Ligand binder design. Structure first.
Ligand code: HEM
Ligand SMILES: C=C1C[C@@H]2[C@H](CC[C@]3(C)C(=O)CC[C@@H]23)[C@@]2(C)C=CC(=O)C=C12
Length: 452
């Protein structure tokens, strides 16, 4: 098998496709190219050949083997946002990534994943007793903002615990995201003409400078302190590693930033799409309340409860399957290989189109939202909402805990209504790095009406 895809127009092949990506958006460009050509095909972002793949078989191969534990993207765009060989998310240096990930992995599982289930519920309870902060005169709640705030609160009180300006940092975090999303695949030419990008350069500084203030304090409280053994957390772990010789201060700093943004960047959008799905699916929402009555009653949500919330678990999966937020994964080939039928040279960029994959394969009723798609145990090789393997989502387990926790704590207390005939299908969406709602539009509010 030779490689499918558009004609290489003697050096015009690349230019049309890279342009198509910038004009369309990374997400909807992938969906376009996969629809036109095969579920496996070649394109050019910048110079380098890049493959876009929805085939579950290829998907599985890639996330499984160790020679795909890299991502890709403009070096100058990454340097701009500070993820060039520094975080983990888009840290593309094999060795430096290898040595940092452990820290993330430890903090996002075991003892911490148990605190998180209650840290979440409390954080949300706080914010639900302060609805005045997010509710309109006509009772319209800004769900997106509320969520982002409890996500940041949650992340902070678990991984860093330093008092911060919640409202302020959330807006800056979004500046950071947008900037990241903008510069990720902008061709080098773009960075030469400075008044075009320096817009973004400023949102990055706004967040980084806001965070240096926080880590500066965490550094003090550590260098004083009585029983240091008593209270280990993500930020401390890193700082002490730096205090040995394991980490650079710059890197530490990026990781803390990367940990704080991660939840607000994804959970909030995901739960938002989940909340709309509940409103327009009354049948499903009844099953979820019964399960809560059966499993929890009027007791505080605890770790031992989460396995029992079976219906909800399926709801979360079906929501992510049907309305994904992270619908694509970027990887790079580190060794040569043959993947399915095709030769894949090292240095080849890969975009796994997991969103399209969850509609072309396995599932009984792919194109409608039903809890029937998850009535029979799903092979983790046909459904990858987080990815798996050496570089799968580091939060994949804690994530599910948090989502379960916040949904329970919310639906426990309020019925949710969507304005007009609005639903996830009829929301206007941007489809670039992630797949999220266009916030320059409106009608994205909800109404929270009490229960009992
Ligand atoms: C429901 C929300 C979430 C979704 C849909 C999601 C999904 C994903 C996916 C698909 C990847 C790419 C993995 C791969 O390449 O196969 C990823 C990576 C990652 N995720 Fe998540 N995730 C979520 C929540 C979180 C949370 C809460 C955190 C941390 C608090 C987190 C931290 C990370 C990090 C640090 C990476 C980069 C991993 C690496 O390259 O080493 N994620 N996530
Ligand atoms: C929404 C996104 C986009 C995700 C990214 C991890 C790497 C992903 C999956 C890619 O290869 C392309 C889109 C990227 C993620 C989940 C990780 C952390 C975060 O803060 C925000 C994220």
């Amino acid at each position: 098998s030779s490689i499918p895809g558009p004609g290489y127009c003697m050096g015009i092949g690349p230019l049309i496709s890279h342009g198509r990506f910038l004009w369309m958006g990374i997400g909807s460009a992938c969906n376009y190219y996969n629809r036109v050509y095969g579920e496996f095909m070649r394109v050019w972002i910048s110079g380098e050949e890049t493959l876009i793949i929805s085939k579950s078989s290829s998907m599985f191969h890639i996330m499984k083997h160790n020679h795909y534990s890299s991502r890709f993207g403009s070096k100058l765009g990454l340097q701009c946002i500070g993820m060039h060989e520094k975080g983990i998310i888009f840290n593309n240096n094999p060795e430096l990534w290898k040595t940092t990930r452990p820290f993330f992995m430890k903090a996002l599982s075991g003892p911490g994943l148990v605190r998180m289930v209650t840290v979440c519920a409390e954080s949300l309870k706080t914010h639900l007793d302060r609805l005045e902060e997010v509710t309109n005169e006509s009772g319209y709640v800004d769900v997106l903002t509320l969520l982002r705030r409890v996500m940041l609160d949650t992340s902070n009180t678990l991984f860093l615990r330093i008092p911060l300006d919640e409202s302020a940092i959330v807006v800056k975090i979004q500046g950071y995201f947008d900037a990241w999303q903008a510069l990720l695949i902008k061709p080098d030419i773009f960075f030469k003409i400075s008044w075009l990008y320096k817009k973004y350069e400023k949102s990055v500084k706004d967040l980084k400078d806001a965070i240096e203030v926080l880590i500066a304090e965490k550094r003090r409280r550590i260098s004083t302190e009585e029983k240091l053994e008593e209270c280990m957390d993500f930020a401390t772990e890193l700082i002490l590693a730096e205090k040995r010789g394991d980490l650079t201060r710059e890197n530490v700093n990026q990781c803390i930033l990367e940990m704080l943004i991660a939840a607000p960047d994804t959970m909030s959008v995901s739960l938002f799409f989940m909340l709309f799905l509940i409103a327009k699916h009354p049948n499903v929402e009844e099953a979820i309340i019964k399960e809560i009555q059966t499993v929890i009653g009027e007791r505080d949500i605890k770790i031992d409860d989460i396995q029992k919330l079976k219906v909800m678990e399926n709801f979360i999966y079906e929501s992510m399957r049907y309305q994904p937020v992270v619908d694509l994964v970027m990887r790079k080939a580190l060794e040569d290989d043959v993947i399915d039928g095709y030769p894949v040279k090292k240095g080849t960029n890969i975009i796994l189109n997991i969103g399209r994959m969850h509609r072309l394969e396995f599932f009984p009723k792919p194109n409608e939202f039903t809890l029937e798609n998850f009535a029979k145990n799903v092979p983790y090789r046909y459904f990858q909402p987080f990815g798996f393997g050496p570089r799968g989502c580091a939060g994949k387990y804690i994530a599910m805990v948090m989502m379960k926790a916040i949904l329970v704590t919310l639906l426990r207390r309020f019925h949710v209504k969507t304005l007009q005939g609005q639903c996830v299908e009829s929301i206007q969406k941007i489809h670039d790095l992630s797949l999220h709602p266009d916030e320059t539009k409106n009608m994205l509010e909800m109404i929270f009406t009490p229960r009992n």
